[PDB]
Curated annotation (Swiss-Prot), chain A:
Function: Component of the SWR1 complex which mediates the ATP-dependent exchange of histone H2A for the H2A variant HZT1 leading to transcriptional regulation of selected genes by chromatin remodeling. Involved in chromosome stability.
Predominant location: nucleus
Organism in which the protein naturally occurs: Saccharomyces cerevisiae (strain ATCC 204508 / S288c)
Pfam family, one: Swc3
InterPro entries: Swc3
Oligomeric form and interacting partners: Component of the SWR1 chromatin remodeling complex composed of at least ACT1, ARP4, RVB1, RVB2, ARP6, YAF9, VPS71, VPS72, SWC3, SWC4, SWC5, SWC7 and SWR1, and perhaps BDF1.
Protein name, as recorded: SWR1-complex protein 3
Gene name of the record: SWC3
Annotated Gene Ontology cellular component terms: chromatin; mitochondrion; nucleus; Swr1 complex
Length: 322, 81
DNA sequence: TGCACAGGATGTATATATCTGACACGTGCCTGGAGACTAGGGAGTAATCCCCTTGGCGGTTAAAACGCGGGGGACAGCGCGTACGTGCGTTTAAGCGGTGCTAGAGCTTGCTACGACCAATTGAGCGGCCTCGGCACCGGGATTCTCCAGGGCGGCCGCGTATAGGGTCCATCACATAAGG
DNA sequence: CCTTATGTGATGGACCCTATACGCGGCCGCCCTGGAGAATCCCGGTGCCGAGGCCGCTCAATTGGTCGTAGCAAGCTCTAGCACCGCTTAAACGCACGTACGCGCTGTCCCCCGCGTTTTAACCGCCAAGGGGATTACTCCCTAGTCTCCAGGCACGTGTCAGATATATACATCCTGTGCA
């Protein structure tokens, strides 16, 4: 935000701190002394920003962050480790960028209790009704790869999935329940799509206000003698919204069932999305001007250069901390 | 009338200190400010009331206030002097 | 079928006017200047007696100055924890003008009683002078506080005895399963 | 389906070696012991010179009378203060998040105290005054305290002029049936 306030009438606007315009840049018409992309680095800045944002953005709801340091808070690390189960390593693409992930399950205790009750019922039903062969080891391996081991047999449906970045293990995010999931059997690729609202906090707070108003009205009526959906409500503020889509690759057959079971009934979210699409304000698509004039944009160029220098200076320490 | 020492509020002390150009304030300041104002008012009011009672009087006039302040050395202009 | 426009509807920045404050011009009364009387405080005059430098000088002394050691006081850094800064939603009562009372303030009285002014007496109070005991200085025995040395415990550190303990790497173990019939 | 006896695959554990407390001893914080000695306390014990007492006397505090107008007592009257109404905000308030500020502790180093040696400022006595300044009094005379008339110019108020507020208008910003392409 503290970036230099661009001089009036520049042929670009500063979007996310960088020079961009809605229309495709016409350098040849607009620039007399264009600095090279090497000189500008705008492309570099954009790429670093993109990757970092993908590491830290709002795409998935955050749920756990490593606490910024005989404090017992150390003892909670193994507890948080055990509250999730450990699962195998998978690749993700974010726009032009790609990332890698290991998978972790969030232990739904109701599924554990119901599994114990189901085993009780099945046992009671059964009681009421009443060298070594390596090929068998290969069969067991394949069965455990496409059928389910005990932890997978309990967590088939309603299991909870946590995402973590293998290049940034500090943050954990929820897999979107309000998402469309397609499992490509031929390519082993999974595409996830969801709509995201930039002022969602505004909508949630107005939703809370409406809930309070309805509760007050019900209390007033009671003094004499609910699937509240903010997106349906006529007084909901305009969502600034974006539709998003992402592809996963590298997930194995057994995990697909867990994932496929985990997401919400499709028609309901489809109708919700259609409402969002009527009421939403779509994010406008714009084009970055990677080339800047060395004379009119000298301040902007140097500012970008300085910020890049600081970013790189910090980035070395990140691995030096490992 | 009760608790009117509180009636000054914090925000009034805030605004007055803002006139004084203070960039940073502490919570304890308010109580001390109230005490100082209390003793100042007590002295000024006692002087004014004795100035009034001399004249076989019942209404404290602006003359009594301004001359009481003059006796405290604090000189005030613009109220009919 | 859907568009162009003929006929019609709320509105409003532009424009014309009405609803409140302040300054200049008119009355009219407690005056400000002026005339003359007045005297006693101010100013001009003359001692007169007392206190202030002479003027640098030497021979001294008490205080000032200058030099030095050092050690601890100031002070720039900074880890960190929180309590004031900024930003909501929400409530109070501070502000606005309005209606009905009044009592305290303003001043005009009519004139009295106490204090301005005056001779005359006399004694309290001031001015001069004289004096012994209240004060000023410190000698003394005793008080008491300072400050390094350091006996001695033992916190902590040192050589190194022998010892108690943790993170680290190794694995043993259970659920329900693989196999024969 | 029954029915032996174990595969599957981690979290749970014993171990290696680490590093440590402390035997005997010292630096050090500290109790305290300890001395030397550098001050400070209180009591003479004394000889000096001022407090304060005593007397001479003079001028101003006190007195009895007179004159007159400043304070007092209504008491007439009128407007500024007081109180309750009751809408309208908006300034206060509770509460949430954070962040940059204040404090605790750090090491550093420079300057200002404790103290010793040198230098300067000051007084005593030389040598006894003359100058000129502040106090004191007499002697006009001029000055503005006084009563009084003259006639005003300054203050209290109303009228007039301007400004801030109010509201038509000449279209402004639009609605909407329907005839045209």
């Amino acid at each position: 935000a503290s970036r230099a306030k661009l001089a009036t009438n520049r042929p670009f606007e500063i979007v996310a701190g960088l020079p961009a315009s809605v229309e495709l840049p016409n350098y040849n018409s607009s620039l007399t002394h264009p600095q090279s992309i090497k000189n500008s680095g705008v492309l570099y800045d954009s790429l670093v920003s993109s990757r970092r944002t993908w590491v830290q953005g709002e795409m998935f709801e955050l749920y756990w962050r490593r606490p910024k340091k005989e404090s017992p808070t150390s003892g909670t690390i193994p507890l948080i480790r055990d509250k999730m189960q450990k699962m195998c390593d998978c690749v993700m693409s974010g726009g032009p960028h790609t990332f890698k992930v290991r998978l972790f399950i969030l232990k739904n205790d109701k599924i554990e209790q119901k599994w114990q009750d189901e085993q009780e019922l099945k046992k009671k039903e059964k009681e009421l009704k009443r060298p070594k062969r390596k090929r068998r080891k290969n069969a067991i391996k394949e069965d455990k790869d496409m059928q389910l081991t005990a932890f997978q047999q309990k967590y088939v449906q309603g299991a909870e999935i946590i995402l973590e970045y293998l290049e940034f293990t500090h943050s954990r995010y929820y897999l979107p329940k309000k998402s469309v999931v397609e499992f490509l059997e031929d390519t082993d690729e999974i595409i996830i799509s969801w709509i995201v609202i930039h002022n969602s906090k505004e909508i949630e707070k107005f939703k809370t206000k409406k809930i309070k108003a309805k509760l007050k009205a019900d209390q007033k009526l009671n003094k004499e003698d609910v699937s509240f959906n903010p997106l349906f409500e006529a007084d909901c503020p305009t969502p600034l919204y974006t539709p998003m889509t992402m592809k996963l690759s590298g997930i194995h057959k057994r995990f697909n069932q867990i994932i496929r079971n985990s997401v919400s009934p499709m028609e309901e979210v489809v109708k919700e999305m259609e409402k969002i699409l009527q009421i939403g304000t779509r994010l406008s698509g714009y084009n970055l001007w990677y080339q800047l004039d060395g004379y009119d944009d000298e301040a902007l160029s140097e500012s970008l250069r300085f910020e890049l220098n600081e970013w790189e200076h910090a980035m070395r320490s990140r691995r030096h901390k490992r | 009338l009760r608790d009117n020492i509180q009636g000054i509020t914090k925000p009034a002390i805030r605004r007055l200190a803002r006139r004084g150009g203070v960039k940073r304030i502490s919570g304890l300041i308010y109580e001390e400010t109230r005490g100082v104002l209390k003793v100042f008012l007590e002295n000024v009011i006692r002087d004014a009331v004795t100035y009034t009672e001399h004249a076989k009087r019942k209404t404290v006039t602006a003359m009594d206030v301004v001359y009481a302040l003059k006796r405290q050395g604090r000189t005030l202009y613009g109220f009919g002097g």
